[PDB]
């Protein structure tokens, strides 16, 4: 029922975590991100990423002039 | 999306922002988010509540504040 299914899904964020190395009070977006990339790092970066990109692309079009 | 398909998507995205006060660097995480959660702010946002009590929950257990 509750084998560390859990712990690495934490683990996982953990390591988004630090692939991104977002602080220590963004494990709940990073824990989301995985819930819908089925956990997926390598899955869960893609969109991380693409958003990062996204939103940063969001500001090089408008450049905030 | 060229119509109202993104342009609402960081609408969402700026508003989970505020829903949760985020700072304006985690948009790509609330853009991710609401990617999964069909960009729905109700359904995101109970997954972000889900981690942030998930996240703060795994605090508790262990005691790490």
Chains 1, 2 share one sequence.
Do not use: T
Request: with cysteine.
């Amino acid at each position: 029922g509750s084998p560390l299914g859990q712990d690495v899904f934490l683990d996982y964020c953990q390591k988004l975590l630090e692939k991104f190395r977002y602080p220590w009070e963004l494990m709940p977006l990073m824990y989301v991100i995985l819930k819908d990339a089925d956990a997926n790092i390598e899955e869960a970066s893609r969109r991380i990423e693409e958003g990062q990109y996204v939103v940063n692309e969001y500001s090089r079009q408008h450049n905030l002039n």
